[PDB]
Design an enzyme around this catalytic site. Structure first.
Site, mmCIF file in Angstrom:
data_model
loop_
_atom_site.group_PDB
_atom_site.id
_atom_site.type_symbol
_atom_site.label_atom_id
_atom_site.label_comp_id
_atom_site.label_asym_id
_atom_site.label_seq_id
_atom_site.Cartn_x
_atom_site.Cartn_y
_atom_site.Cartn_z
ATOM 1 N N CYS B 65 0.795 -1.224 0.000
ATOM 2 C CA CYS B 65 0.000 0.000 0.000
ATOM 3 C C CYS B 65 0.835 1.285 0.000
ATOM 4 C CB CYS B 65 -0.910 0.012 1.225
ATOM 5 S SG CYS B 65 -1.890 1.532 1.379
ATOM 6 N N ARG B 68 0.073 4.648 2.899
ATOM 7 C CA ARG B 68 0.205 4.440 4.346
ATOM 8 C C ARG B 68 0.551 5.665 5.212
ATOM 9 N NH1 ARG B 68 4.201 -0.327 4.908
ATOM 10 N NH2 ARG B 68 4.654 -0.119 2.653
ATOM 11 N N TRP B 237 -9.249 6.292 -0.430
ATOM 12 C CA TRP B 237 -9.697 6.859 -1.695
ATOM 13 C C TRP B 237 -8.802 6.309 -2.798
ATOM 14 C CZ3 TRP B 237 -8.109 10.160 2.365
ATOM 15 C CH2 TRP B 237 -6.756 10.518 2.330
ATOM 16 N N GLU B 242 -5.259 3.354 -10.556
ATOM 17 C CA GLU B 242 -6.005 2.116 -10.312
ATOM 18 C C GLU B 242 -7.170 2.012 -11.271
ATOM 19 O OE1 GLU B 242 -6.596 0.927 -6.074
ATOM 20 O OE2 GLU B 242 -6.131 3.064 -5.753
HETATM 21 C C1 HEM Z 1 -6.141 6.658 1.908
HETATM 22 C C2 HEM Z 1 -6.100 6.272 0.620
HETATM 23 C C3 HEM Z 1 -5.410 5.054 0.126
HETATM 24 C C4 HEM Z 1 -4.735 4.956 -1.052
HETATM 25 C C5 HEM Z 1 -4.552 6.063 -2.066
HETATM 26 C C6 HEM Z 1 -4.228 3.629 -1.161
HETATM 27 C C7 HEM Z 1 -3.493 3.185 -2.265
HETATM 28 C C8 HEM Z 1 -3.335 1.832 -2.512
HETATM 29 C C9 HEM Z 1 -3.042 1.270 -3.782
HETATM 30 C C10 HEM Z 1 -2.868 2.018 -5.082
HETATM 31 C C11 HEM Z 1 -2.935 -0.074 -3.632
HETATM 32 C C12 HEM Z 1 -2.635 -1.067 -4.734
HETATM 33 C C13 HEM Z 1 -3.899 -1.909 -4.952
HETATM 34 C C14 HEM Z 1 -4.093 -2.536 -6.307
HETATM 35 O O1 HEM Z 1 -3.317 -2.289 -7.263
HETATM 36 O O2 HEM Z 1 -5.058 -3.339 -6.474
HETATM 37 C C15 HEM Z 1 -3.178 -0.353 -2.262
HETATM 38 C C16 HEM Z 1 -3.115 -1.623 -1.742
HETATM 39 C C17 HEM Z 1 -3.508 -1.850 -0.440
HETATM 40 N N1 HEM Z 1 -3.960 -0.964 0.471
HETATM 41 FE FE1 HEM Z 1 -4.077 0.921 0.330
HETATM 42 N N2 HEM Z 1 -4.601 2.909 -0.098
HETATM 43 C C18 HEM Z 1 -5.298 3.704 0.754
HETATM 44 C C19 HEM Z 1 -5.907 3.371 1.970
HETATM 45 C C20 HEM Z 1 -5.872 2.108 2.564
HETATM 46 C C21 HEM Z 1 -6.515 1.734 3.761
HETATM 47 C C22 HEM Z 1 -7.397 2.666 4.564
HETATM 48 C C23 HEM Z 1 -6.169 0.406 4.042
HETATM 49 C C24 HEM Z 1 -6.588 -0.439 5.188
HETATM 50 C C25 HEM Z 1 -7.020 0.022 6.375
HETATM 51 C C26 HEM Z 1 -5.313 -0.029 2.963
HETATM 52 C C27 HEM Z 1 -4.721 -1.268 2.836
HETATM 53 C C28 HEM Z 1 -4.209 -1.689 1.595
HETATM 54 C C29 HEM Z 1 -3.932 -3.116 1.363
HETATM 55 C C30 HEM Z 1 -4.106 -4.229 2.372
HETATM 56 C C31 HEM Z 1 -3.495 -3.218 0.088
HETATM 57 C C32 HEM Z 1 -3.034 -4.438 -0.692
HETATM 58 C C33 HEM Z 1 -3.960 -5.648 -0.674
HETATM 59 C C34 HEM Z 1 -3.523 -6.693 -1.668
HETATM 60 O O3 HEM Z 1 -2.537 -7.416 -1.407
HETATM 61 O O4 HEM Z 1 -4.172 -6.836 -2.729
HETATM 62 N N3 HEM Z 1 -5.145 1.043 2.118
HETATM 63 N N4 HEM Z 1 -3.410 0.824 -1.570
HETATM 64 C C1 S90 Z 2 -7.076 -7.081 -7.353
HETATM 65 N N1 S90 Z 2 -5.932 -7.778 -6.735
HETATM 66 C C2 S90 Z 2 -5.848 -7.431 -5.303
HETATM 67 C C3 S90 Z 2 -7.153 -7.865 -4.649
HETATM 68 N N2 S90 Z 2 -7.494 -7.046 -3.480
HETATM 69 C C4 S90 Z 2 -7.237 -5.679 -3.241
HETATM 70 C C5 S90 Z 2 -6.945 -5.388 -1.917
HETATM 71 C C6 S90 Z 2 -6.697 -4.097 -1.485
HETATM 72 F F1 S90 Z 2 -6.394 -3.864 -0.194
HETATM 73 C C7 S90 Z 2 -6.764 -3.056 -2.393
HETATM 74 C C8 S90 Z 2 -7.081 -3.305 -3.720
HETATM 75 C C9 S90 Z 2 -7.155 -2.091 -4.621
HETATM 76 C C10 S90 Z 2 -8.338 -1.207 -4.225
HETATM 77 C C11 S90 Z 2 -8.080 -0.094 -3.218
HETATM 78 C C12 S90 Z 2 -8.379 -0.263 -1.867
HETATM 79 C C13 S90 Z 2 -8.169 0.768 -0.963
HETATM 80 C C14 S90 Z 2 -8.482 0.562 0.491
HETATM 81 C C15 S90 Z 2 -7.674 1.981 -1.415
HETATM 82 C C16 S90 Z 2 -7.399 2.125 -2.770
HETATM 83 N N3 S90 Z 2 -6.922 3.297 -3.250
HETATM 84 N N4 S90 Z 2 -7.610 1.103 -3.629
HETATM 85 C C17 S90 Z 2 -7.332 -4.619 -4.161
HETATM 86 C C18 S90 Z 2 -8.284 -7.722 -2.428
HETATM 87 C C19 S90 Z 2 -7.454 -8.826 -1.799
HETATM 88 C C20 S90 Z 2 -8.525 -9.186 -2.815
HETATM 89 CL CL CL Z 3 -10.358 -1.180 -7.613
#
Ligand code: HEM
Ligand code: S90
Ligand code: CL
Ligand code: HEM
Ligand code: S90
Ligand code: H4B
Ligand code: H4B
Ligand code: CL
Lengths: 362, 362
Positions: B65, B68, B237, B242
């Protein structure tokens, strides 16, 4: 221990090489010949066939290289016979000329005598045979910052650069038994350069950008069957992003994105306008167009990735494991538009291969 | 073994959490209380402070992420009190409303009762609370292919989609003791969507693209001190890429690049024209512009990376190790234009954290 390492690496390489060359029956006698030679001399000498195929295997095993589809057509020049600095210089001059091939670039490697007991016979200081100098003094940056330390080293040896943004560094290398390297100015008739223009935007020429035609990596070690060829410069042709997304774009290289934005007529004021991204695309279109217009080989990252897909298919069909470094294989622009981004790669090191070695300056 | 795992995870979490909260003196009595409770019940119950800080730590530890920097301002909603499907539904509806906040998105997590002996109390089937359906039949693709299997599962349960490209999937989840999940249609008044237009190119609206405002991941497990919260949907957000570089661009998603090329008036015929790259940039500019125009929160990848740099600086200054997944942190367009591309990250897993879990359909 060292002889044992050599023999073990030798056994593995000869078996694999001869297998690939359909010479499996000859493995045993060759191995015996080698073992005696190691015993009597502390080393062994590759046949021309072994050296050629070894350099090809090394390219095939280079995890960070997207261009590997063409590994088997590498042009291998055997220069293990050189003994003098004039011979090394002329061999490097020749590599440039034959690799350049009037713009129709031939992937080539020139192989000099290998290390003996870790003792280099020929030590090349250049990072690439053709590269631009870099200067930094009193807040003033000129040329390619990646070349600053080598440029300073050259100017310690009596060379002086003109301090344009595109000074060609001289060839610089040291012979076994010499305290200092020698340097030779590159004949300009040997060096093809390409002025950067844009297909639609006439103003792009106001940036007065150019780049050299052929990237010739000259500071890596080729290792083949335990033999260390520390001097073995090689080249392919450029993938456009190397020039447009990195060499000309990185803040620690030529740093041209703000100037690009201005000549293509967009504001460089707000991150949300994605002006850096747009500038990158236009600069990269300009690089591809300019090389093509001049008849110098280049590949775009989409075509390159498609070729790499064929390399993956070929490896599986031949029963070879594929290795790769995802972080280097993805191109630096639109990586998610290539298949590479969406799969993973085993980053294991297989030999023969090309390796980093410590710089003699710095 | 299982109780021992729990106690070990509990000791590590409580010490770290209370340290961060300046409650270090209370660690011993709390640990004793917990140990008795595990002995007598097979588990333990977090205080509201532990749960809140635990969810924040989990975000801070999410290697993939880029967002963070804002971990400590997460809005944590404690719904461990729910017992009925109507309560779960209303809690999910509420999460959508309060997270959306009329477009000024609030990063929020709603936490439902945790697993007891691996036995889920509430099992959410949706990948995100708001997402579009996908259909594939007789060569005909409609909607989001990533949703095909869940869509098929929903249509097994009596739901029927209208088969537009943007059908909102219903909420779908199962309660402990029920054989089948239930489904509820999303009230449209709760769901903000954004039509995609371009700042300069009027024709871009001819594509009739849109996307939903708030991404709410609902299928990951939150683990805190050995307690497994399998149902704990969370949201931030969007980062624009994305939507523009993946959701709308991937060949296995909405696959819009050829149509984008056509409306922006460029040929989509030659790899060397970099038309995919140019289309990607314009589509991504359009996404950012449209969200901003509608007053829905979004961040561009340059600003996001700058914020992530501050997260790195903050971690070091606080004496915490930084972990990260380089392959997910780099944005899918112009990654080399961000600092992330030029350094490396330790991809070690630290808890508390969010984890993948097996789907109940498929
Ligand atoms: C505040 C705005 C936030 C932005 C801009 C952001 C941005 C991102 C982005 C761009 C990804 C890549 C996801 C993808 O390509 O599918 C991501 C992954 C992730 N974010 Fe964030 N995020 C935010 C908030 C959060 C919050 C609030 C949480 C949890 C409390 C979180 C937990 C995660 C997790 C767990 C992943 C990866 C999950 C996976 O392995 O697929 N994020 N984030
Ligand atoms: C698609 N492959 C990953 C799958 N996936 C995912 C998880 C995220 F935390 C976040 C995302 C992307 C969506 C997202 C989630 C949040 C919390 C913020 C943000 N800017 N964008 C996908 C969930 C685990 C199945
Ligand atoms: Cl999405
Ligand atoms: C035929 C055209 C070729 C193309 C288009 C190509 C493409 C590339 C590219 C884009 C890189 C990334 C380099 C960087 O970002 O700095 C690379 C790395 C590399 N290529 Fe190739 N390559 C080609 C030929 C060759 C040849 C002929 C060899 C050797 C015989 C070779 C060996 C390597 C090695 C060793 C690296 C990585 C070295 C490192 O770790 O820095 N390539 N290649
Ligand atoms: C700059 N960081 C890496 C340094 N580096 C490098 C090596 C390559 F093989 C290739 C390159 C890129 C140049 C190149 C080389 C070749 C052979 C083909 C091609 N298209 N491009 C750099 C040499 C090891 C010091
Ligand atoms: C195999 C590879 O790791 C995979 O395609 C990843 C690459 N990086 C990514 N990065 C983000 N942010 N999101 C993704 O879905 C992916 N996919
Ligand atoms: C830290 C990171 O691995 C490093 O910046 C890499 C990323 N990927 C790369 N990929 C290529 N092709 N060339 C490079 O110089 C780099 N730099
Ligand atoms: Cl280069």
């Amino acid at each position: 221990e060292e002889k044992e390492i050599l023999w073990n690496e030798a056994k593995a390489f000869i078996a694999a090489c001869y297998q690939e060359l359909g010479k499996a029956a000859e493995v045993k006698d060759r191995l015996a010949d080698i073992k005696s030679e190691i015993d009597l001399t502390g080393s062994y000498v590759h046949t021309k066939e072994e050296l050629e195929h070894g350099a090809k295997m090394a390219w095939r095993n280079s995890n960070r290289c997207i261009g590997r589809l063409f590994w088997n057509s590498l042009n291998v020049i055997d220069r293990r016979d050189v003994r003098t600095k004039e011979e090394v210089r002329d061999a490097l001059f020749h590599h440039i000329e034959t690799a350049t091939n009037n713009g129709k670039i031939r992937p080539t490697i020139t192989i000099f005598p290998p290390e003996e007991k870790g003792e280099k016979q020929v030590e090349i200081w250049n990072h690439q045979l053709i590269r631009y100098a870099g200067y930094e003094s009193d807040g003033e940056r000129i040329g390619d910052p990646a070349s600053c330390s080598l440029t300073a080293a050259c100017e310690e040896l009596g060379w002086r650069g003109e301090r344009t943004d595109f000074d060609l560094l001289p060839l610089i290398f040291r012979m076994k038994g010499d305290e200092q390297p020698v340097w030779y100015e590159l004949p300009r008739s040997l060096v093809i350069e390409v002025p950067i223009t844009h297909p639609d935007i006439e103003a792009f020429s106001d940036l007065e950008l150019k780049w050299y035609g052929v990237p010739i990596i000259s500071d890596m070690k080729l290792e083949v069957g335990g033999i260390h060829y520390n001097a073995a410069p090689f080249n392919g042709w450029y993938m456009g992003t190397e020039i447009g997304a990195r060499n000309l774009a990185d803040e620690k290289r030529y740093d041209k994105l703000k100037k690009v934005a201005s000549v293509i007529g967009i504001a460089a004021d707000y991150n949300t306008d994605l002006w850096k991204d747009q500038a990158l695309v236009e600069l990269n279109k300009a690089v591809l167009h300019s090389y093509k217009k001049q008849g110098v080989s280049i590949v775009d990252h989409h075509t390159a990735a498609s070729q790499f897909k064929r390399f993956e298919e070929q490896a599986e069909e031949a029963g070879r494991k594929l290795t790769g470094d995802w972080t280097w294989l993805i191109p630096p622009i639109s990586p998610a538009a290539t298949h590479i981004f969406h799969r993973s790669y085993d980053n294991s090191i297989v030999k023969p291969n090309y390796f980093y070695q410590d710089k003699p300056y710095e």
